[PDB]
DNA sequence: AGCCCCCTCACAGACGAGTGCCCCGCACTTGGA
DNA sequence: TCCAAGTGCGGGGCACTCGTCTGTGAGGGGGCT
């Protein structure tokens, strides 16, 4: 219809200037996109270092496994047991890669199972692949990458010097049987010639790989299995170290932690998406305005404070919390000064932050202290890690919870001993927490200038009861006042302009990063008075089938009651009772909903139709 | 095959009619399934057992032997005990 | 939206609220900006067509920057066809090879060369007809990982994420935006992917001993209410309507070619029933 | 209760006294 | 020691059910001679009948059906390229004890269902 | 009183010849050097 | 006296294509407790 839409080309080019930041200056030099880039670069940095020291002992493994068979027919392999996320483990490969060109032991080829699909295409690729690995480290067509050229290279260059020749799978399950059971035979038939060392990446168990190798393949196979570790440690290691650590001043709710954490648990182990979803919630927070840009460290916070202009203040004062700031106040002049002079409120602002940081960094003491106090119990509601009792304590009162007094009566019933040894690891756990971590931060000595006279009276509390039935209640109860009242408040109980930090925005993440086409497309056939807001298609009940509906309402509500087979003069009448050019709008609407795919014609009868949901 | 008449036969069919042997040979008690199929897997890559042209345990197959051949081999067979000669005849 | 399994088992106004729909979803294109400049890309799975929604964003925002727009919905395009485009036309090296992912590592090697020359490409119908193979969405989630190559997408089946497995939805950095319009598929459903006056039409073009051949079939249909090639063969020669036995095969090789005649081994049955064929046998009298 | 409209009414209040 | 998520296990075992079950022994149970064959919609509607929880069709759970399809514990025994159209038919295979190790880490029993 | 079990017939798959098309090597070669 | 890269053209790999062939899933038809 348009002229861009043609009949015989598919593509168009809009090339211009093409040779051999999408954002200008205006939004770069903004101070919110440059405290989230920060953010964004720290957090980024903390999680690499985190997979890095939790992958670093299995490659060394991996190097003396390479380095003792370099040292050294069947030739060896190594499966590497990795997870069901083979897409967040390549990267494994690739360090290892490194550690084989830092000692000069091997030489790395990855064949992936897309270009292997026959056995001359996978060993096109090996060769190709070990040539242009030396070539990159100190060209040939693929018609002549053959066996015979690789070992001519092999004899003509590293005889002199043995280096291996390492091949990584790291889709092993998705590889073709035959071309593997090929590939592995050739290898095995060059061996005492080319040293060749075949590393795997099994994602299942071992069961997969004794089922699809037989009996003369792995008659030539010398295996051993190497143990990555799982997925799920790898979320609690990511959540307890960088997503729960006091030195980043942006904060997740308790709704959105549940939410990210509900997605990796129960639809996928990938670290890849948790992090892509996490940047997604950092991004939506700090692109709220450059008011936003507060949520940093003090000294910055404070230059920001000296920096912003007209519109931040009446953007900071729309906040739902900062009313209870307003309304607790009883005097007049302050009203009339922090509401529309716009600079008593500039004056007033770093106490609020100050406040702030200081109930984030308490909460987080807190936290640590109540669930060391928790962890030892049998049967933990509470929680046993630190993150459910982050949600349990953010989502609401955890105090006025059943399952706290549920803790509780569960706690009071322990003799001395345990309850002592109990809450003296308590005490030390949360020092060790205040002096290890706490401390070279910024605005951390207040934070334990507050804990720690609190804390020594705790340590009398628990003198006290070592000296000593009736002290119990009264170190339960010096608890509940010193740690749990007024450092573990709820989301609501909070400082008054905390939606700086908090990220509390749940519907839009959760519309945008889990997608529902089907919702919307069932929505948006049902009711169009949903979208369109008109005043004509509005129902009472989502079946009533008013005949002043968008045209592919009706005819979905009247093929929505039939069976399977779809006749189709009878839905032309009950279209036709319903609301030339009526049976063209009839083949418009069919054609838009086989479009669709909810129906599709019938091939074996001819003016019917077959329905494909139910 | 001598029951049902040149029949295709399954992994499944063959290992238990195997086990029903096996749980009262005393002397191949404890023999798993995985050495059974790998003994499967042999007979399969040396041509005495063909299939007919799904998972390995589920495809089926045919018998490449006369049964006279059988007959010489359980007479040639060095050391054969005696329950797998009594299973033979019978 | 939770569907039920029991279903399975026993088996004006329109028009200004439509353009104040088209601008609240015109206001969405600096914060599609700001999204995209930081990795993602942007799926669309409302339920209206989003072609002009597609092309605004292109009109208005990216008039400047490399574009190639893919027609998902054309029903006879090919992965050569863009690859080849992306190689050639773009970068200006040549023709892709003709595996094609061997021309998406060329295209990743010579974008990992040149920074700050970022490739938009928007495809009206990731799911259209002859991309929904597996192979054509691993290339496509290959050619959405690079970071200079950013992607819209639109989708509009209900089956579509059943071929993107875990990988092909972890390298599409997707953002899942729902644009529903309420404009009908014109452009999507006008192509190639989706009786009596042809009868009449192609019967006022014969000669007349294709007349006779023609009626003979006709009588003897609506008579027996299919026919053997030898019982039209003795009719056809006894009324002098052919020569030999391949004048007679050729008049039926057009009849087969035009769609008049089906012929099954050698009956030979008209597809219609018999109330028309009797209007029509009664319209040439 | 919309922001401009609390606004109002504690600058209503608090300019009575 | 395989590791899975909770709808992938479900779903591994609502095609486990679907493929050691006849086609006319569906309709007794859920209401409320290897693998047989099945098609896409029926392992979700034997999903969403053992299920008992009701979430909502996403874009992750075809996804974990396409990912435990790459991951060799389901296959394509027929169709396989009109997947979206309905026509293709998948075919469970993993045995019986994994599925009553994964039902007692999950806490449903697969001994009534059969 | 809806349900239980065979029939069968055009899709599904294979397959097999077989034939045309497109990439690719490769000498030509030529205006230039 | 030669020569660097376009280039013109043959040849082989591949992909469609027409015909054959056979299982077969579900719509259809005949009996049922």
């Known amino acids: 219809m348009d002229p861009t839409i043609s009949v015989s080309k598919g593509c168009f080019v809009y090339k211009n200037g093409a040779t051999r930041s999408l954002l200008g200056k205006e939004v770069v030099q903004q101070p919110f996109y440059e405290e989230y880039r920060k953010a964004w670069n720290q957090i980024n940095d903390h999680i690499a270092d985190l997979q890095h020291r939790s992958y670093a002992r299995t490659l060394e493994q991996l190097v003396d496994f390479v380095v003792g068979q370099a040292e050294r027919e069947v030739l060896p392999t190594a499966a590497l047991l990795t997870g069901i996320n083979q897409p967040d483990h390549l990267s494994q490969f690739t360090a290892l890669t490194q550690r084989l060109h830092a000692q000069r032991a091997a030489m790395v080829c990855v064949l992936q199972s897309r270009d292997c699909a026959t056995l001359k295409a996978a060993v096109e690729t090996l060769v190709f692949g070990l040539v242009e690995d030396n070539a990159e480290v100190e060209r040939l067509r693929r018609s002549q990458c053959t066996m015979k050229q690789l070992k001519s290279w092999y004899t003509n260059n590293f005889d002199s010097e043995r280096r291996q020749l390492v091949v990584i799978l790291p889709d092993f399950e998705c590889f073709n049987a035959s071309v593997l059971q090929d590939l592995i035979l050739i290898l095995s038939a060059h061996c005492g010639s080319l040293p060749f060392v075949l590393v795997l990446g099994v994602a299942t168990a071992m069961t997969a790989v004794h089922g699809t190798l037989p009996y003369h393949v792995s008659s030539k196979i010398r295996l051993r299995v190497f143990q990555t570790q799982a997925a799920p440690t790898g979320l609690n290691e990511v959540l307890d170290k960088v997503l729960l650590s006091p030195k980043y001043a942006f904060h997740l709710s308790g709704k959105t932690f549940k939410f990210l954490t509900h997605i990796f648990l129960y639809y996928d182990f990938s670290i890849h998406g948790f992090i892509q979803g996490f940047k997604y919630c950092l991004m939506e927070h700090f692109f709220g305005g450059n008011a936003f840009a507060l949520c940093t460290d003090y000294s910055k916070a404070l230059g920001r404070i000296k920096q912003l202009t007209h519109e931040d203040m009446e953007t900071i004062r729309r906040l739902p919390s900062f009313r209870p700031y307003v309304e607790q106040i009883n005097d007049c002049k302050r009203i009339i000064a922090v509401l529309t002079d716009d600079d008593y409120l500039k004056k007033k602002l770093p106490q609020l932050l100050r406040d702030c940081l200081l109930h984030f960094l308490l909460f987080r003491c807190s936290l640590e202290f109540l669930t060391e106090l928790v962890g030892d119990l049998p049967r933990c509601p509470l929680g046993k890690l630190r993150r459910e009792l982050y949600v349990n304590c953010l989502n609401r009162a955890i105090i006025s919870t059943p399952e706290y007094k549920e803790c509780l009566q569960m706690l009071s019933f322990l003799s001395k001993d345990e309850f002592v040894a109990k809450v003296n690891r308590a005490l030390e756990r949360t020092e060790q927490f205040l002096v290890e971590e706490i401390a070279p931060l910024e605005l951390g000595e207040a934070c334990t200038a507050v804990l720690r006279p609190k804390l020594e009276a705790i340590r009398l509390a628990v003198d006290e009861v070592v000296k000593a039935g009736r002290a119990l209640q009264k170190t339960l109860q010096l608890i509940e006042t010193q740690i749990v009242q007024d450092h573990l408040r709820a989301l609501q109980d909070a400082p008054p302009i905390h939606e700086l930090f908090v990220f509390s925005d749940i519907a839009t993440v959760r519309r945008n990063i889990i997608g529902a086409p089907r919702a919307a497309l069932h929505t948006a056939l049902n009711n169009p008075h949903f979208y369109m807001q008109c005043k004509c298609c509005e129902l009472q009940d989502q079946s009533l089938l008013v005949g002043t509906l968008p045209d592919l309402s009706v005819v979905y509500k009247l093929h929505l009651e039939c069976g399977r087979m779809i006749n189709l003069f009878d839905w032309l009448q009950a279209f036709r009772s319903v609301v030339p050019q009526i049976q063209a709008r009839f083949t418009r609407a069919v054609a838009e909903l086989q479009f669709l795919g909810y129906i599709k014609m019938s091939k074996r009868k001819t003016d019917h139709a077959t329905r494909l949901t139910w | ?90 | 939206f939770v569907p039920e399994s029991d279903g399975y088992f026993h088996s004006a106004e329109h028009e200004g609220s439509i353009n104040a729909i088209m601008e609240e979803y015109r206001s969405y294109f600096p914060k599609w900006m700001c999204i995209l400049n930081e990795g993602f890309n942007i799926l669309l799975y409302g339920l209206g067509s989003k072609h002009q929604l597609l092309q605004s964003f292109h009109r208005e925002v990216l008039h400047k920057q490399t574009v190639l727009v893919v027609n998902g919905f054309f029903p006879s395009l090919t992965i050569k066809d863009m690859l080849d485009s992306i190689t050639s036309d773009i970068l200006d090296a040549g023709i892709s090879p003709a595996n094609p992912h061997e021309a998406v590592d060329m295209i990743e090697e010579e974008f990992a060369l040149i920074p700050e020359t970022h490739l938009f490409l928007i495809v009206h119908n990731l799911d259209g007809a002859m991309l929904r193979n597996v192979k054509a969405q691993a290339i496509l989630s290959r050619l959405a990982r690079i970071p200079n190559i950013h992607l819209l997408a639109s989708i509009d089946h209900i089956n579509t994420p059943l071929l993107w497995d875990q990988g092909k939805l972890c390298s599409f950095n997707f953002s899942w935006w729902d644009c529903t319009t309420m404009l009908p598929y014109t452009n999507e459903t006008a192509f190639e992917n989706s009786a009596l006056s042809s009868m009449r039409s192609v019967f006022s073009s014969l000669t007349t001993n294709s007349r006779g051949i023609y009626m003979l079939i006709v009588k003897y249909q609506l008579k027996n209410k299919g026919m053997p090639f030898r019982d039209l063969y003795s009719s056809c020669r006894e009324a002098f309507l052919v020569s030999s036995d391949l004048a007679l095969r050729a008049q039926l090789t057009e009849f087969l070619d035009h769609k008049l005649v089906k012929s099954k081994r050698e009956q030979l049955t008209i597809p219609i029933d018999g109330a028309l064929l009797q209007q029509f046998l009664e319209e040439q009298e | 209760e919309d922001y401009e409209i609390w606004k109002a009414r504690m600058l209503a209040k608090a300019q009575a006294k | 020691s395989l590791e899975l998520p909770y709808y992938a296990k479900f779903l591994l075992i609502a095609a486990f059910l679907a493929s050691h079950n006849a086609a006319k022994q569906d309709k007794r149970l859920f209401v409320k001679l290897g693998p047989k064959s099945f098609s896409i919609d029926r392992l979700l509607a034997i999903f969403y009948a053992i299920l008992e929880e009701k979430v909502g069709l996403t874009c992750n759970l075809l996804s974990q059906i396409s990912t435990l399809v790459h991951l060799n514990l389901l296959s394509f025994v027929s169709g396989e390229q009109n997947i979206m159209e309905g026509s293709a038919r998948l075919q469970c295979t993993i045995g019986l004890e994994f599925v009553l190790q994964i039902g007692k880490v999950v806490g449903f029993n697969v001994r009534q269902y059969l």
């Not at chain 2, 499967?40 to 005495?48: C, D, N, T």
């Open chain 2, 1 to 90: 095959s001598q029951i049902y008449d040149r029949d295709s036969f399954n992994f499944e069919i063959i290992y238990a009619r195997f086990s029903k042997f096996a749980k009262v040979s005393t002397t191949m008690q404890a023999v798993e399934r995985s050495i059974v199929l790998k003994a499967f897997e042999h007979l399969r890559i040396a041509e005495l057992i063909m299939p007919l042209t799904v998972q390995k345990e589920f495809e089926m197959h045919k018998l490449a032997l006369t049964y006279s051949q059988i007959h010489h081999c359980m007479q040639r067979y060095q050391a054969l005990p005696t329950e797998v000669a009594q299973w033979a005849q019978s």
